[PDB]
Amino acid sequence: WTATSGSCKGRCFELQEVGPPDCRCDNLCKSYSSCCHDFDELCLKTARGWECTKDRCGEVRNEENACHCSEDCLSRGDCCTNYQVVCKGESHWVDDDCEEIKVPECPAGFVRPPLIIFSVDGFRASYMKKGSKVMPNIEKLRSCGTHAPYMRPVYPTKTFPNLYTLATGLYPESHGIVGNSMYDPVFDASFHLRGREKFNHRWWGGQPLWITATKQGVRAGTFFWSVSIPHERRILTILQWLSLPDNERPSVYAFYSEQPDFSGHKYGPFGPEMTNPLREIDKTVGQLMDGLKQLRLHRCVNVIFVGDHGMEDVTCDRTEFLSNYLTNVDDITLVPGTLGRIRAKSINNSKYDPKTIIAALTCKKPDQHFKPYMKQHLPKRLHYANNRRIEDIHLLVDRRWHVARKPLDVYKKCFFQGDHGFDNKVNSMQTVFVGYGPTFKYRTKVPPFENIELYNVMCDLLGLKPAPNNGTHGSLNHLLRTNTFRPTMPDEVSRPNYPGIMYLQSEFDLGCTCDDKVENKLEELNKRLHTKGSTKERHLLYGRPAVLYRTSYDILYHTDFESGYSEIFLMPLWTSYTISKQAEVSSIPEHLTNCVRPDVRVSPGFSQNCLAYKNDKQMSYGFLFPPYLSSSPEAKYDAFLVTNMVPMYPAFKRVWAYFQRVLVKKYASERNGVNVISGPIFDYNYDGLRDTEDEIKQYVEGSSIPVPTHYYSIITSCLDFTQPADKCDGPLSVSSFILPHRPDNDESCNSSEDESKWVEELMKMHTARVRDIEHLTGLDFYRKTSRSYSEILTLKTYLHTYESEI
Numbered sequence: 001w002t003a004t005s006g007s008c009k010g011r012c013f014e015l016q017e018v019g020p021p022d023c024r025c026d027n028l029c030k031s032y033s034s035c036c037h038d039f040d041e042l043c044l045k046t047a048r049g050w051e052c053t054k055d056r057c058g059e060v061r062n063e064e065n066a067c068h069c070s071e072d073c074l075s076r077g078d079c080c081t082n083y084q085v086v087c088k089g090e091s092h093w094v095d096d097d098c099e100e101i102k103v104p105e106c107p108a109g110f111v112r113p114p115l116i117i118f119s120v121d122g123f124r125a126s127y128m129k130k131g132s133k134v135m136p137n138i139e140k141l142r143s144c145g146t147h148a149p150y151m152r153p154v155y156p157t158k159t160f161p162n163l164y165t166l167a168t169g170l171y172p173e174s175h176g177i178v179g180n181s182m183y184d185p186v187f188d189a190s191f192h193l194r195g196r197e198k199f200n201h202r203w204w205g206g207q208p209l210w211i212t213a214t215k216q217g218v219r220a221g222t223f224f225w226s227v228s229i230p231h232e233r234r235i236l237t238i239l240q241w242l243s244l245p246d247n248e249r250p251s252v253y254a255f256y257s258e259q260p261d262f263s264g265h266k267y268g269p270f271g272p273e274m275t276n277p278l279r280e281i282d283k284t285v286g287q288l289m290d291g292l293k294q295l296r297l298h299r300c301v302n303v304i305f306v307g308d309h310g311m312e313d314v315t316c317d318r319t320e321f322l323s324n325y326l327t328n329v330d331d332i333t334l335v336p337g338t339l340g341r342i343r344a345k346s347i348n349n350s351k352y353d354p355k356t357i358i359a360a361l362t363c364k365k366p367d368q369h370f371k372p373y374m375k376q377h378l379p380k381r382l383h384y385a386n387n388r389r390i391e392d393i394h395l396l397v398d399r400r401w402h403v404a405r406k407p408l409d410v411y412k413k414c415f416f417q418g419d420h421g422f423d424n425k426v427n428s429m430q431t432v433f434v435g436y437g438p439t440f441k442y443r444t445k446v447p448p449f450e451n452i453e454l455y456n457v458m459c460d461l462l463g464l465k466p467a468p469n470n471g472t473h474g475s476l477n478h479l480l481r482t483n484t485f486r487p488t489m490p491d492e493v494s495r496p497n498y499p500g501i502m503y504l505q506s507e508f509d510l511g512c513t514c515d516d517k518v519e520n521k522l523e524e525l526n527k528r529l530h531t532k533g534s535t536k537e538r539h540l541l542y543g544r545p546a547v548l549y550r551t552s553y554d555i556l557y558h559t560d561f562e563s564g565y566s567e568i569f570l571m572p573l574w575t576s577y578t579i580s581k582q583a584e585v586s587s588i589p590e591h592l593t594n595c596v597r598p599d600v601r602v603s604p605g606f607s608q609n610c611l612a613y614k615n616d617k618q619m620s621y622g623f624l625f626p627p628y629l630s631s632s633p634e635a636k637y638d639a640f641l642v643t644n645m646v647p648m649y650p651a652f653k654r655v656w657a658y659f660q661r662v663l664v665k666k667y668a669s670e671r672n673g674v675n676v677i678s679g680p681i682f683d684y685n686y687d688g689l690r691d692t693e694d695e696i697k698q699y700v701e702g703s704s705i706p707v708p709t710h711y712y713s714i715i716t717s718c719l720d721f722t723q724p725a726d727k728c729d730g731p732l733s734v735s736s737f738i739l740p741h742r743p744d745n746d747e748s749c750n751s752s753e754d755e756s757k758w759v760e761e762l763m764k765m766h767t768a769r770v771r772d773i774e775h776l777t778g779l780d781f782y783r784k785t786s787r788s789y790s791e792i793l794t795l796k797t798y799l800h801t802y803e804s805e806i
């Protein structure tokens with residue numbers, strides 16, 4: 001109930017939600033059924049349209065007009081945006097040559113350049129080129145300001161998750177808006193797009209930018225716009241707010257356009273009907289820029305033109321039905337569409353079994369257009385697991401497809417030709433970023449980046465301290481002229497030990513054997529040098545990783561590789577080695593197939609043992625530095641040390657062996673040498689963060705050898721591939737992965753074929769940023785390079801996506 005007896009007289013789009021119970025006049029009042037009786041009359045005037053015409057020039061002020069062409073309009077803050085063009089012979093902003101904005105040019109009383117966020121729903125990245133002829137304003141912003149070829153949204157590439165990610169710098173799993181539709185078991189509540197429940201504060205986690213601003217004394221315009229308020233009125237409202245007195249005027253603003261998404265759903269991403277929506281958005285941008293120019297603000301305000309996600313071609317006939325797979329189809333609840341989430345229809349159903357459901361959905365039809373996952377097995381790059389609102393069972397749907405429960409759902413819920421929501425690496429889902437203003441760079445292209453990074457930058461633009469978030473602060477400094485944030489490297493917490501030879505062979509009782517008893521200070525003083533670190537500048541190219549938590553670990557040097565060996569987890573945290581373009585691949589000799597050797601630098605009590613691997617029927621082992629890449633027959637013995645061993649399922653050893661025997665050489669060949677850092681990851685609670693020892697849910701049987709959930713590799717080389725990886729004078733190039741350590745290869749439907757037909761495709765799917773691996777290991781990489789730290793942060797957030805060109 002709202003007593004709407006009050007009046008919006010003088011309160012149109014007021015920046016405070018009034019003391020309850022009261023009559024409301026803000027952008028949200030329609031949504032709450034709380035607007036004053038005269039809201040439409042006073043605050044949503046339309047009379048005479050949105051443009052000045054010559055005959056209106058100097059008119060006598062008629063308050064009924066939507067906007068004014070009277071002489072006092074600049075003072076009242078309410079001219080139509082084209083007033084000075086039509087009445088004062090000024091030019092439209094788009095027609096002006098662009099001129100570098102070296103410093104903010106603001107009216108007196110402006111304490112900081114304002115920030116205007118102009119967000120566009122479904123604005124696919126390729127619209128910037130493909131629609132450029134019909135978007136002159138947007139094209140000027142783009143070419144004159146700072147732009148990226150595209151911006152990566154978060155998964156799921158839906159609207160609320162991405163807009164709220166833009167505002168918070170958080171992964172959906174952390175901010176809590178994990179889809180357009182949600183169930184929260186704790187609250188026992190549901191979130192729907194249509195309705196009232198979506199406004200309830202409990203859904204919205206983290207700290208959105210408007211709150212960050214407010215708490216730090218920076219006033220914000222309201223981010224939400226009611227759907228029925230036309231764009232022209234949205235623009236005039238922002239412009240009016242920008243004419244408020246100094247003590248009342250917000251410094252940050254948001255605009256939101258439902259287009260081009262709205263038409264994109266109906267007509268597809270490139271339907272001929274899409275041209276007009278693009279024209280219209282551009283016209284709106286033009287109205288903003290003309291309006292700013294009238295206020296002498298067009299060289300003061302920073303404007304961000306940003307999309308939430310792209311749009312893909314999707315039609316009704318391209319729908320997979322769960323009823324073609326499950327016989328028990330009515331015992332489940334499915335959240336459907338461009339992603340799938342499955343839970344039990346009833347929690348009193350004790351005959352509900354996620355494992356048979358997953359199995360019934362696994363590789364069942366030859367061209368199957370979705371893949372089932374337990375959420376913790378989703379590629380780590382999606383960061384889509386750590387929230388009670390995300391169902392244990394998940395379907396990754398192929399681009400261009402939908403999943404639904406039964407055919408009746410699709411015809412008694414074609415209507416639509418476009419949709420989005422797919423994997424955030426998908427080209428069609430990529431969206432846009434342009435920054436224009438005094439604080440952004442001039443005519444500058446920057447590499448693609450993730451939308452999670454923007455919150456930090458928006459905080460920088462406003463002089464705000466960002467709340468804790470998933471951005472890497474400083475990774476986008478290259479977008480900015482000034483206001484850069486100068487981060488320092490985190491301090492190493494644990495310093496390594498440097499163990500020498502301290503144990504005799506016979507002190508070890510590991511059930512390991514090796515055929516290594518085969519026998520001159522020429523090559524005897526030389527092997528001492530290699531164990532002291534004589535080749536370490538070759539295999540450790542960017543300094544050792546810093547360990548950012550309290551632990552006990554040893555640096556171990558070898559001819560071919562260096563490792564940081566954890567006495568706590570009984571294996572390396574990291575193993576670093578360089579493979580030149582010229583390196584030769586050899587096999588593991590017949591006599592050395594089962595060879596595991598005690599490491600006389602490391603105590604029996606801090607070593608693994610072969611017995612545990614013999615007794616454990618499920619678990620085998622692999623090596624971090626690959627024996628296949630040993631530099632000499634003698635060096636090869638080093639690769640068999642018990643301190644280079646890690647636990648591996650036979651099914652996963654298929655993946656790992658192929659990567660080590662075939663792919664590393666191939667990368668070294670294509671990239672002119674590679675440096676590789678591999679290691680284990682433990683994330684049993686799937687929070688994206690390094691497990692502590694007491695979080696490990698699985699051990700090699702009858703041992704304290706913990707089982708990794710994943711294995712990572714970071715593969716670095718020279719950006720200029722004419723220089724070898726170990727002699728690179730400039731910027732680096734990286735690709736990384738976090739492979740799930742699974743006892744089966746069910747995820748790969750082709751896995752019974754030769755590794756050459758499925759292993760690399762698996763690896764590509766599990767591509768990762770170095771930053772993802774940092775979170776997962778508590779390690780800090782690239783501590784010693786010749787590169788600026790901000791450039792290193794950018795490199796660390798890079799993701800190799802394996803899509804073709806946009």
Ligand SMILES: *[C@@H]1O[C@H](CO)[C@@H](O[C@@H]2O[C@H](CO)[C@@H](O[C@@H]3O[C@H](CO[C@H]4O[C@H](CO)[C@@H](O)[C@H](O[C@H]5O[C@H](CO)[C@@H](O)[C@H](O)[C@@H]5O[C@H]5O[C@H](CO)[C@@H](O)[C@H](O)[C@@H]5O)[C@@H]4O)[C@@H](O)[C@H](O[C@H]4O[C@H](CO)[C@@H](O)[C@H](O)[C@@H]4O[C@H]4O[C@H](CO)[C@@H](O)[C@H](O)[C@@H]4O)[C@@H]3O)[C@H](O)[C@H]2NC(C)=O)[C@H](O)[C@H]1NC(C)=O
Nearest residue numbers: 173174175176204205206386387388468469470687688775
């Ligand atoms: C991406 O960036 C984000 C942001 O930086 C990272 O997330 C942070 O990670 C921290 C480490 O996991 C986490 O810190 C914990 O906070 C607990 C209390 O936190 C509350 O207050 C904060 C601050 O305002 C608030 O942000 C939190 O909001 C969460 O919860 C509400 C309600 O559900 C949501 O509205 C909101 O969306 C958010 O949910 C998300 O996070 C929670 C985890 O907090 C998830 O469960 C959800 O799924 C969702 O993702 C909270 O309201 C605090 O209790 C923790 O402290 C425990 O552990 C420490 C060890 O240091 C110990 O000292 C304490 O005693 C305590 O242990 C006790 O609790 C244990 C569990 O109950 C119990 O087992 C013990 O026996 C003890 O009793 C902890 O410090 C921080 O909350 C989040 N922040 C956010 C916004 O998510 C994220 O990690 C980054 N991701 C990556 C991949 O890098």
Ligand SMILES: CCOc1cc(C#N)ccc1COC(=O)N1C[C@@H]2CN(C(=O)c3ccc4[nH]nnc4c3)C[C@H]2C1
Nearest residue numbers: 117119159163164166167193223224225254255256261
């Ligand atoms: C929530 C955070 O809101 C921001 C953060 C920033 C930032 N940074 C900037 C602007 C904003 C402002 O958003 C708004 O005014 N809103 C009002 C719109 C209603 N809504 C939908 O119903 C909807 C639902 C499903 C869809 N599928 N496809 N299209 C869809 C559209 C999307 C909402 C965006």
Ligand SMILES: [Ca+2]
Nearest residue numbers: 683689690691
């Ligand atoms: Ca963890």
Ligand SMILES: [Cl-]
Nearest residue numbers: 158179180181
């Ligand atoms: Cl959803």
Ligand SMILES: [K+]
Nearest residue numbers: 613616619620
């Ligand atoms: K075994």
Ligand code: NA
Nearest residue numbers: 745746748751
């Ligand atoms: Na398989």
Ligand SMILES: [Zn+2]
Nearest residue numbers: 122159261265
């Ligand atoms: Zn949409």
